[PDB]
Design a protein around this ligand. Structure first.
Ligand SMILES: Nc1nc2c(ncn2COC(CO)CO)c(=O)[nH]1
Ligand SMILES: Nc1nc2c(ncn2COC(CO)CO)c(=O)[nH]1
Lengths: 306, 312
């Protein structure tokens, strides 16, 4: 059975993931950011609506409950392309193919972002701005797809000042340079990194909730000590406790790697290739699995990629 | 090797589903209620009053399509979370099919009030059909529909419209208001779901039948859920569904293909719907469980869900 290697380039925006990922491409397909869906197919300038609303909230022109609706709905438009792609690609994914110290894959897929970014990370960041309710965030987490084998997540490490410099240059249409959002999102990713490691080292959130591997205070679980989620006595409602169970299960089998972005696109692209050797690949489930994938990828890039 | 039996009583609101379910449980059996408490206090405040009010405002002409849709799609993610987690926490326990149609009796029977697709597809569609939501968003939800676990027996129910209406005109749901337009929309939507499931089981293909827009003969695609997704919005100038939307429909057929749909007529006495549903139950697929200790676990979380989100 042929082997596939999927790589999800993910992390906060404005670090040049794209600029480097293209330089890697132009055995390998690259699934681009679904801009056309965000700007036209799914709605109409979602990115702008998102940033405006936060801004209008940031100025008091509208309420935090009103901003919450709009913020939650948009996130539904922002993450769909990732959901369909994962639901359709899941049947073809077999099981771990003795990753590392193995052979070179028949096909490498570089996705631009994983469904958790739109389902977990950004909404988390949006709550942290007072635009999203923690209940709504937990609603998206409950809907997070089971973790297929070989999910390699590449997150980025960039110094603030440098991320503030690149960010400014690469502004999506309708996007405003919200530095707080920049800060909330990098925190979220930092914690996401810590969580997967906390989990992979045997961490039980339920055991530590009363507050080697990271300490729970340094994991996504910290944000769930929100007054809205607890009973009149502080007991986490079970509905939310269970969602957390799901979160914990989804993340621990994820394979995460770090790409130092503080460098030239050549450097970035070079490194990204390096990381590829420690990555987990998988056996396609069938002969026609490979070519079927290629077309999902190409048909995607072609229709949504902007 | 113990076996589990799961039954999801779905269908439109106002037919007497809760009662029959309550009755059936009174005759082991575990009942997973309607997380009403999550719907009006825990998850968001008085979500039902919102849904119904907002559609009303939309209808009266005090709200615009975008304004309402934005409000309706948030309300839906809220309404569905309980079912979503329940499914995900249940999931790791469900094992392979076992069978009931002339097979032994389960160790546990879970009667769930509704199924996730209620929140993630039927109602959303009805609202799209009401103009308070968009096909794209309905499709976004469809993409998030959890994978179907084996032995998912879905009981849908019937009642003539006229009796459905008087039945609705009576027992007042907190926050609801007799929106007859919605009632019919919801009935068509669950009608099509029955057909879709049957359409897909009779070998039918949507792509193969796109150009045309068992428990009886094979249904005309135009009688299945798919017929709802022929809206300009989802159309490429080439006349075909943009792939995005077309892949959403591929999942909708993967999800509904392995469900076991059963119809229970609610045009009868409560004791009878009970007995009637007690009958359908004889030939409902069973599943084994993965860890023997799944029975106690499944049993306790079913009770926890009830004590925290029920009745309200
Ligand atoms: N899912 C989600 N993504 C968001 C959001 N804000 C910003 N992004 C993603 O960043 C943009 C550019 O600002 C494209 O990379 C948001 O609220 N939700
Ligand atoms: N998810 C969702 N559920 C709805 C809606 N309208 C009604 N219900 C559910 O019916 C209520 C009372 O009418 C009890 O379940 C709606 O727009 N979305």
């Amino acid at each position: 059975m042929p082997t596939l290697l999927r790589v999800y380039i993910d992390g906060p925006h404005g670090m040049g993931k794209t600029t480097t990922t293209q330089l890697l491409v132009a055995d390998i397909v690259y699934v681009p950011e679904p801009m056309t869906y965000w700007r036209v197919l799914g709605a109409s300038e979602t990115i702008a609506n998102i940033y405006t609303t936060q801004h209008r909230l940031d100025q008091g022109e509208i309420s935090a409950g009103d901003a919450a609706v709009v913020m939650t709905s948009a996130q539904i438009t922002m993450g769909m392309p990732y959901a369909v792609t994962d639901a359709v690609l899941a049947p073809h994914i077999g099981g771990e193919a003795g990753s590392s110290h193995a052979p070179p894959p028949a096909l490498t897929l570089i996705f631009d972002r994983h469904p958790i970014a739109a389902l977990l990370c950004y909404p988390a960041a949006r709550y942290l701005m007072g635009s999203m309710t923690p209940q709504a965030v937990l609603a998206f987490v409950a809907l997070i797809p089971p973790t297929l084998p070989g999910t390699n997540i590449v997150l980025g490490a960039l110094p603030e000042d440098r991320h503030i410099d690149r960010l400014a240059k690469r502004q999506r249409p309708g996007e405003r340079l919200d530095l707080a959002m920049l800060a909330a999102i990098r925190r979220v990713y930092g914690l996401l990194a810590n969580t997967v490691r906390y989990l992979q080292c045997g961490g039980s959130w339920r055991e530590d909730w009363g507050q080697p591997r990271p300490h729970i205070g340094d994991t996504l679980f910290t944000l769930f000590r929100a007054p809205e989620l607890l009973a009149p006595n502080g007991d986490l409602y079970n509905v939310f406790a269970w969602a957390l169970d799901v979160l914990a299960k989804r993340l621990r089998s994820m394979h995460v790697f770090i790409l130092d972005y503080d460098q030239s696109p050549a450097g970035c692209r070079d490194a990204l290739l390096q990381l590829t050797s420690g990555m987990v690949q998988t056996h396609v489930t069938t002969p026609g699995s490979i070519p079927t994938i290629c077309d999902l990828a190409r048909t995607f890039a072609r229709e949504m990629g902007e």
